[PDB]
């Protein structure tokens, strides 16, 4: 029955494999989008108010149902055919499906003359579709079906195709809503502040933040204030309580202080009462609120109405926005004050801003919902204006012409295309970085980009606290994978078994709590709240309970049985403070864990047995979760959980550590993400090395996707001979690194050989490189289109001619065909022409606008595709193919942060060799190891020697006590090798033995995208910028290198004044001006007629020539634009 330790390493990984058979790696994206389409769009459409318009006749126009068909593309002819994602990629279409809404317009004029007209399936917009979602044409297709459609079966999906560009929505971090968080700002007028970003269940407005603060000590005592929304002045809490109908101080403290035996709380609230005694009735308090507001009505009536509306709608919407909710709002605001007092009295800890239990991940669904709310509101507005301008004339109108569908369509398309998350007009208030271009450089880069999280703290911020690896990231975020540049700690990555909750309605839970012995908050007396336990659901205090323990037992039983409580519902019992917080909302990152009985796992051997035959008896992960054996625990419920790292922790020990565990890790290696799960032996490296590899696995070459032959990507690198690593971890089985690997096993020798590998460089074998070692192919796609925008000027693909075309370069166009497009198989060098495009003029009647190769490439045309774009003019894509043979300067890396460029390449006779004539493919310098402490590199090399000599794949899973260095060495000594991986090598040049026995063996190396040929650049008098006549910027522009301020300072320190003048004047922008010797302002010179005159001074004899930079002339002219007179006085 029990899984014994000897079977555990199989059982756990069997369980893990079942998880990845059920979910995958992009499950969060697909589930978010599916919830958005199934629920969020319908909720948004129904939550909009019916637009009642009347001059008389009236019309309501109620939207009642939505229909999202499959993605479809319509041609000029109008025939209807399904649009496949690959066709969208090739034709630069948007993989979107039409959204139709049912509309009901009832005519009501008078005399009960009512009649309803329903417009079924009114086309309301187009919604882009996430690939492999339920509403994707690739849904449920087999691998054969996907290959029939020219799709990769290993492609995870989880992205959109907007204008042929694959866009991926990055999950955005945000502070959780409807939760009270008591912080303390050191530099502020308030000692403690308790904030609550409140938002109603079905979002319709932004988060309304309410603060309840305490004024810092230094009138008599500490005063509690409340910064309500839409009010620009602090308001005492007692005033707010009275404005809600609680005038008696006893009632207010009944709502705030639940234990009247506690004078400390009492004296700390007393200043607030003493400050609010002149106001003692609800109307006067409402008048005070309205007066403190930023729109103080001259008459107290409208002041009181405004205060009523604010306190009913903007104050704590999550508690309830309807009327008669003042009791719930009063209880909740009293809870906020109670929490603030507990913090000020030291009875509760301040809340941690960085705790991921306090955060939420805004995924594709809830982000598209924000867009859709804004866009549907704008659409209903436009419909209101259109219908108003017609009914004002007293006649009917056609809603089909009122609905301008471009709002929703173009809005979603623009937002996903650019990443600016918001309305196109508010292009600066909008937050960019959402919806990035999917990284297709290697399969690991694609997976990681699809599992990418973002902390929008702002890269400019230099506070390290949000960048720090918090304790609560354990199991939810990769500890290693993070960019090492300016976004350290802000851009994160999901751990492998991390699941972001999609969201759920609290209705069944609330109904069960009602049927259960919970007492509502309006029905109780406050005297009961002392000993009772509060119950919050999605932040709303809904009631109280008397035995929280058996309530938690009941709820956990219900969630483990897949009863009314779904698996993703978090249920935290804080014991010391008697809250029970239940969460069903979306964005809660959680992970699966094995539940533990008294001191035993519930995962018995029968579950492993049924999981082994997963493909026959359809016993899956969901059956494991439904059995009550596995549980999803979120960051906030982990605080109440006692984990076992392994079932070995559940053994009874000579001194028991815990003996009351509640859960167990499925495997600790699941704390790593996609790119860190490729590192072998990451627990033997320094952690920065693991981070650098997690970044560098994403630039590694491989086969980024199986269907690369049909993709017209702008840039693509494919390795000739990708190999799976000889030394692998058990997590790559689910990353599909074995099916799409990104490196080669290289016989690497760590040695000092000729000095060409010093300081992070490598010596490669020229003979190996000749045999296809780390050879790659580079595919570059050029796009072009001939626009017939108007009869004024039209472009067209056609072989240009020297007699008709004007802007025709001296490059030869013979490689083009009569259609103007080069043919595949044609070898093209730099500056060559691949598309001959000519544009009609207003060298006559047509000018050359041909597409050249990006300079200095020298490839062969791989293929040419011609089609029609969305509007329907001819559209061409040409993929050119360039074989990249590794060379000096190309960057290579192992899986341990050990990067370096090729210093030199030696032939096989020049490389050092073992007694059996094995030469290293790569030689790396021993000095790269000691400071870096990448012992995982050495253990991987030794394990790889054992694996190659044994005919297996080494197990480098991080935390594995069945694999240590002594075992690997003992294994290697059985194959006739030195047990530590050393060998006697001979000098290739002289054949003499090397005195020091070299450490050599197979290690998995990666070829990175950074090849020297894509970086080398030179300039000598090339093109210049228009504004300031200085060299351009970039290799692509043939630009010059920037001689910056620091270079100026260095050369000033050198004392090199002529070199400094050469760099900053003569090699950048030499120029001449003519200055009036009297006024010092630039004069008018006419060198052809030799007439120089200053219009200002009315002189034409006292002019002087001045040699100045063009940028300085431009500066002085831009100062004269500002009415400044910079007078260059030559005397």
């Amino acid at each position: 029955d029990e899984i014994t330790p000897d079977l555990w390493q199989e059982a756990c990984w069997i369980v893990i494999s079942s998880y990845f058979d059920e979910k995958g790696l992009v499950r969060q994206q697909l589930d978010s989008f599916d919830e958005f389409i199934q629920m969020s769009v319908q909720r948004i459409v129904e939550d909009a108010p019916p637009i009642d318009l009347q001059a008389p006749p009236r019309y309501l126009l109620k939207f009642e149902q939505i229909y999202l068909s499959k993605p479809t593309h319509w041609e000029r002819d109008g025939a209807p055919s399904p649009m496949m994602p690959n066709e969208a990629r090739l034709r630069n279409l948007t993989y979107s499906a039409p959204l139709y809404v049912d509309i009901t317009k009832t005519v009501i004029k008078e005399g009960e003359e009512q009649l309803q007209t329903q417009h079924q399936k009114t086309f309301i917009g187009k919604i882009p579709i996430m690939l492999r979602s339920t509403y994707c044409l690739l849904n449920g297709l087999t691998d054969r079906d996907l290959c029939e459609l020219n799709e990769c079966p290993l492609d995870p999906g989880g992205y959109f195709i907007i204008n042929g560009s694959e866009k991926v929505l990055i999950a955005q971090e945000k502070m959780a809503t409807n939760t009270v968080y008591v912080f303390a700002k050191k530099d502020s007028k308030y000692a403690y502040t308790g904030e609550c970003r409140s938002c109603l269940e079905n979002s319709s407005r932004p988060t309304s933040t309410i603060w309840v603060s305490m004024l810092a000590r230094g009138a008599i005592g500490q005063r509690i204030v409340a910064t309500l929304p839409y009010i620009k002045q602090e308001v005492p809490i007692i005033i707010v309580f009275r404005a809600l109908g609680f005038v008696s101080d006893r009632d207010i403290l009944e709502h705030i202080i639940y234990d009247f035996e506690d004078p400390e709380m009492m004296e700390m609230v007393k200043p607030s009462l003493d400050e609010a005694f002149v106001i003692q009735e609800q109307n006067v308090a409402l008048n005070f609120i309205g007066s403190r507001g930023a729109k103080p009505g001259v008459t107290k009536e409208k002041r009181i109405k405004y205060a009523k509306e604010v306190l009913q709608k903007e104050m704590l919407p999550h508690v309830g926005v309807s009327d008669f909710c003042e009791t719930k709002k009063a209880y909740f605001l009293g809870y906020m004050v109670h929490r603030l007092l507990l913090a000020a009295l030291g009875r509760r800890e301040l809340d941690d801003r960085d705790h991921y239990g306090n955060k939420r991940l805004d995924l594709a669904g809830p982000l598209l919902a924000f867009l859709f709310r804004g866009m549907f509101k704008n659409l209903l507005k436009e419909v209101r204006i259109y219908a108003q301008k017609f009914i004002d004339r007293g006649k009917d109108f056609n809603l089909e012409l009122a609905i301008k569908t471009r709002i929703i369509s173009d809005g979603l398309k623009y937002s996903l295309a650019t990443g600016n998350w918001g309305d196109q007009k508010k292009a600066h208030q909008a937050r960019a970085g959402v919806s990035q271009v999917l990284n297709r450089l290697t399969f690991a880069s694609t997976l990681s980009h699809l599992r990418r999280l973002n902390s929008p703290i702002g890269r400019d911020g230099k506070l390290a606290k949000p960048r720090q690896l918090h304790n609560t990231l354990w199991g939810m975020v990769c500890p290693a994978e993070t960019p090492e540049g300016h976004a350290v700690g802000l851009v994160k990555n999901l751990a492998l078994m991390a699941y972001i909750s999609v969201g759920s309605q609290p209705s069944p839970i609330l109904e069960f709590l009602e049927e259960w012995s919970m007492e509502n908050l309006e029905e109780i007396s406050p005297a009961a709240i002392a000993d009772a336990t509060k119950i919050f659901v999605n932040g709303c205090w809904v009631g109280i309970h008397k035995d929280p323990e058996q309530l938690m037992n009941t709820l956990r039983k219900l969630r483990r049985q897949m009863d009314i409580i779904v698996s993703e519902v978090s249920m935290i019992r804080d014991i010391r403070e008697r809250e029970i917080r239940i969460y069903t909302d979306a964005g809660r990152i959680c992970r699966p864990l094995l539940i533990v009985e008294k001191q035993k796992l519930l995962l018995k051997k029968r579950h492993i047995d049924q999981l082994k035959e997963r493909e026959y008896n359809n016993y899956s992960w969901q059956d494991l979760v439904a059995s009550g054996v596995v549980e999803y625990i979120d960051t906030l419920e982990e605080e109440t959980v006692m984990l076992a790292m392994t079932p070995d922790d559940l053994q009874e020990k000579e001194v028991a550590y815990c003996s009351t565990y509640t859960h167990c890790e499925i495997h600790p290696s699941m704390i790593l993400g996609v790119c860190a799960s490729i590192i072998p032996f990451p627990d033997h490296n320094q952690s920065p090395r693991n981070t650098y590899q997690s970044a560098m696995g994403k630039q590694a070459m491989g086969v980024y996707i199986t269907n690369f032959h049909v993709r017209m990507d702008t840039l693509a690198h494919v390795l000739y001979y990708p190999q799976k690593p000889l030394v692998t971890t058990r997590s790559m089985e689910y990353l599909r690194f074995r099916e799409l690997p990104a490196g080669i096993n290289s016989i690497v020798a760590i040695a000092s050989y000729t000095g060409y590998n010093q300081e992070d460089s490598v010596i490669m074998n020229r003979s190996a490189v000749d045999r296809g070692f780390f050879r790659s192919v580079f595919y570059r796609s050029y796009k072009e289109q001939e626009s017939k925008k108007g009869f004024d000027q039209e472009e067209v693909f056609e072989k240009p001619t020297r007699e008709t075309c004007q802007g025709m370069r001296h490059a030869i166009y013979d490689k083009l065909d009569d259609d103007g497009l080069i043919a595949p198989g044609v070898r093209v060098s730099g500056d060559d022409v691949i598309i001959g495009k000519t544009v009609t003029l207003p060298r006559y009647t047509k000018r050359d606008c041909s597409t050249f190769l990006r300079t200095s490439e020298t490839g062969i045309v791989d293929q040419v595709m011609v089609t029609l774009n969305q509007e329907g003019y001819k559209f061409c894509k040409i993929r050119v193919r360039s074989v990249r043979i590794p060379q000096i300067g190309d960057k290579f890396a192992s899986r341990h942060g050990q990067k370096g460029t090729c210093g030199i390449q030696y032939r096989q006779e020049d490389m050092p060799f073992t007694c059996e004539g094995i030469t290293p493919d790569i030689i790396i310098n021993p000095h790269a190891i000691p400071s870096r402490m990448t012992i995982g590199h050495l253990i991987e090399c030794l394990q790889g020697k054992v694996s190659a000599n044994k005919g297996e794949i080494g197990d480098a899973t991080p935390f594995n006590d069945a694999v240590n260095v002594q075992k690997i060495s003992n294994l290697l000594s059985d194959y006739g090798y030195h047990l530590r991986g050393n060998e006697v090598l001979y000098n290739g040049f002289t054949g003499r033995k090397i005195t020091s026995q070299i450490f050599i063996g197979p290690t998995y190396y990666q070829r990175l995208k950074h090849m020297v040929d894509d970086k080398i650049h030179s300039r000598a008098r090339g093109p210049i910028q228009i504004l300031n006549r200085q060299p351009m910027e970039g290799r692509s522009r043939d630009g010059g290198l920037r001689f910056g301020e620091m270079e100026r300072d260095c050369q000033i320190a050198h004392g090199a004044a002529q070199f400094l003048r050469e760099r900053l004047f003569e090699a950048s922008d030499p120029y001449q001006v003519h200055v009036c010797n009297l006024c010092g302002i630039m004069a008018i010179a006419n060198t052809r007629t030799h007439t120089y005159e200053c219009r200002g001074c009315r002189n034409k004899t006292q002019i002087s020539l001045v040699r100045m930079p063009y940028a300085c002339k431009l500066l002085f002219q831009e100062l004269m634009s500002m009415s400044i007179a910079p007078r260059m006085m030559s005397v």
Partner: protein, 117 residues
Amino acid sequence: PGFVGIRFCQECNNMLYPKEDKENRILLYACRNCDYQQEADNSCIYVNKITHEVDELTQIIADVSQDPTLPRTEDHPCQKCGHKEAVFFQSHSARAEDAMRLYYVCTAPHCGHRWTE
């Protein structure tokens, strides 16, 4: 000394503020909303414990013994019920510097005795 609690009027249920009656030279607690008055019984109006000599045993609740994440010990039996097992934990409360002190709670149900060594 001990703290002093707030007391409310019997008519308007607002807090009673302190006042002095010169005629009898006696402390009274009177409401500044209604016209109620009361004869005080403590004679102390304000108390500040600067030292903050708070007995944290009063802040503990027996329910904490149900926490699976707290450590348990068999070495400190309960003086009230004789149960062997007991959870222990530190103060973890602000304004307490010498907070390495351990507080124990009996894990027996319905006993919930709390103490300190």
